[PDB]
Amino acid sequence: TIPHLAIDPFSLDFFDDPYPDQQTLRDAGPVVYLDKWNVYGVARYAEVHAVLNDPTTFCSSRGVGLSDFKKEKPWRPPSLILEADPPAHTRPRAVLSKVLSPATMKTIRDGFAAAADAKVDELLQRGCIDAIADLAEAYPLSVFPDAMGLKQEGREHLLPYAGLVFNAFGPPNELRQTAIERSAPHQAYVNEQCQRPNLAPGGFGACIHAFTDTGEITPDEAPLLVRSLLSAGLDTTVNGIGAAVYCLARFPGELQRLRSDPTLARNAFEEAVRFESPVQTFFRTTTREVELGGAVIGEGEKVLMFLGSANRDPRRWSDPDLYDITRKTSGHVGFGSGVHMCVGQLVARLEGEVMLSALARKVAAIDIDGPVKRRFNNTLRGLESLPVKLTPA
Ligand code: HEM
Ligand SMILES: CSc1ccc(C(=O)O)cc1
Numbered sequence: 543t544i545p546h547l548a549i550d551p552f553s554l555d556f557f558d559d560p561y562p563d564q565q566t567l568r569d570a571g572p573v574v575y576l577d578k579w580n581v582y583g584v585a586r587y588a589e590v591h592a593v594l595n596d597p598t599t600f601c602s603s604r605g606v607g608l609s610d611f612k613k614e615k616p617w618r619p620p621s622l623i624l625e626a627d628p629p630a631h632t633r634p635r636a637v638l639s640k641v642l643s644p645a646t647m648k649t650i651r652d653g654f655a656a657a658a659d660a661k662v663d664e665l666l667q668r669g670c671i672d673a674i675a676d677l678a679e680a681y682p683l684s685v686f687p688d689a690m691g692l693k694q695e696g697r698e699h700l701l702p703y704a705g706l707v708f709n710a711f712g713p714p715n716e717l718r719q720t721a722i723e724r725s726a727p728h729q730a731y732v733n734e735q736c737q738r739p740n741l742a743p744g745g746f747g748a749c750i751h752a753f754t755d756t757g758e759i760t761p762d763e764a765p766l767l768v769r770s771l772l773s774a775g776l777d778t779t780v781n782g783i784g785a786a787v788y789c790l791a792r793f794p795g796e797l798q799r800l801r802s803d804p805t806l807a808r809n810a811f812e813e814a815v816r817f818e819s820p821v822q823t824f825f826r827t828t829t830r831e832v833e834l835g836g837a838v839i840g841e842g843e844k845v846l847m848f849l850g851s852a853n854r855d856p857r858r859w860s861d862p863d864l865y866d867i868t869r870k871t872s873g874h875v876g877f878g879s880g881v882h883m884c885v886g887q888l889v890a891r892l893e894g895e896v897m898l899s900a901l902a903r904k905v906a907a908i909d910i911d912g913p914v915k916r917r918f919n920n921t922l923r924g925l926e927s928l929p930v931k932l933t934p935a
C-alpha cells in the first residue's frame with residue numbers, strides 16, 4: 543500500500559537539487575516509506591498540513607529530528623517549546639509569544655530599518671559583494687544579537703551553534719556527526735549567555751527572565767527559553783534573507799516590480815520563504831496507530847514532513863516554481879502551522895521586510911557576478927556564497 547523509496551533526503555546530492563526528488567516523493571503517494579532511514583515521509587501540502595495540525599497524534603516531545611527521545615538521549619536537554627507537547631508547551635509558548643510580540647516589534651522597528659538601510663548603502667559603496675557573508679549574514683548579525691541583549695564577546699559562536707542545531711535534527715550522517723564533535727565550545731558559550739546576568743536590560747533575553755514571576759514559567763525555565771531564541775532566531779533569518787535576495791537575483795522582473803512598489807517588501811519576503819523554504823524539513827512521532835491519506839502508520843513511528851515540497855505542491859499552488867511577490871501566500875508552511883507555528887515570525891518578517899524595503903528603494907539591479915556555492919545542512923536550505931553586483935538606483 544505504501545510505496546518504499548530509496549531517496550535519501552539528507553544526502554548531498556538531494557540538497558544540491560531537491561526538486562525532482564521532491565516531485566518523485568509527492569507523486570509516489572500521500573505517504574511514502576523511506577527505506578534509507580526507516581521513516582515515513584509526507585511531501586504533499588495536504589498531508590504535511592494535516593500532520594502539523596494534529597499535535598496529539600503527531601507529537602514533538604519525542605523529538606522533531608530523526609532521533610526518537612524515547613529510544614536515544616537528546617544531544618542537549620530538550621527545548622521547552624519546540625520539543626514539548628501541549629499542555630507543557632503552552633505556557634512557555636505564551637511567554638515567547640508576549641516577548642516577541644506586536645509591541646516589541648514596535649520598539650525595535652526603527653532600529654532594524656535603520657540598520658538595513660545603512661547596510662544596503664554600505665554595500666553600494668563596494669558594488670561587488672557576497673550577498674551571503676556581506677548581507678544575509680552581516681545584516682541579522684548587526685541587529686539580532688543586540689536585540690537579544692548579548693554581550694559582544696563570543697558572537698562568532700552563534701552561527702556555528704545554529705548550524706549544529708539544525709544539522710542535529712538530521713540522521714546520524716557525517717554532517718550531523720561532525721557537527722556534534724565540534725559542539726563543545728559553542729554549547730558552552732550559548733549556555734552561559736542564557737543566564738540572566740549576561741543579558742542586557744530591554745532585550746529579548748532579559749524579557750524572558752522578567753516573565754518568570756507570572757506563574758507561566760519558573761526561573762529555572764528561562765535559560766532554556768533564551769537558548770531557544772539563540773538556536774532558532776538567527777540562522778533561519780540568514781537563510782530567509784539569503785533566499786529573498788537570491789530570488790530577486792534570479793527573477794529580475796520581480797525586482798523591478800518590487801522597486802516600483804516597495805510596500806510589496808513584506809510579501810516579497812513571505813514568497814521567498816515559501817519558494818525556498820529555508821527550513822526544509824521536520825519530523826513528528828506518532829503517539830498511536832493512525833490512518834493518514836488512506837495509509838496506516840503504527841505507534842512510535844517517525845514521520846518526516848517535507849515543508850519545502852509542501853510549498854511547491856502543484857496540488858495546492860498555481861505555478862509553484864515561480865517567484866511571485868504578489869502571490870497570495872497565506873497557508874504556506876515555511877513557518878510551520880498549528881500550535882508550533884513559528885513564534886518568532888514577527889522578527890523574521892520585520893527583518894525581511896526592512897531589508898527588502900531598503901533594496902527596493904536603493905538598488906536598481908542585482909546580477910550574479912560569480913560562482914554560486916551551496917551550503918549543506920540537514921535541515922537548512924541556503925547558500926554558502928552568492929557573489930552579486932549591486933547597481934545603485
Ligand atoms: C525566515 C525565518 C524563519 C523560519 C523559516 C522559521 C521556521 C520555523 C518553523 C518551520 C517552525 C515550526 C517548527 C515545528 O513545527 O516543529 C518554527 C518554530 C519556531 N521558531 Fe521559527 N523560523 C524563522 C525565524 C525565527 C526567529 C527570528 C525566531 C526567534 C527570534 C524563531 C524562533 C522559533 C521558535 C522558538 C520555534 C518553536 C515554536 C514552537 O514550538 O511553538 N524563528 N520556526
Ligand atoms: C524551527 S527551528 C528551531 C526552533 C526552536 C528551537 C529551540 O527551541 O531551541 C530550535 C530550532
Ligand SMILES: [Cl-]
Pocket residue numbers: 618728729730732733
Ligand atoms: Cl547547548
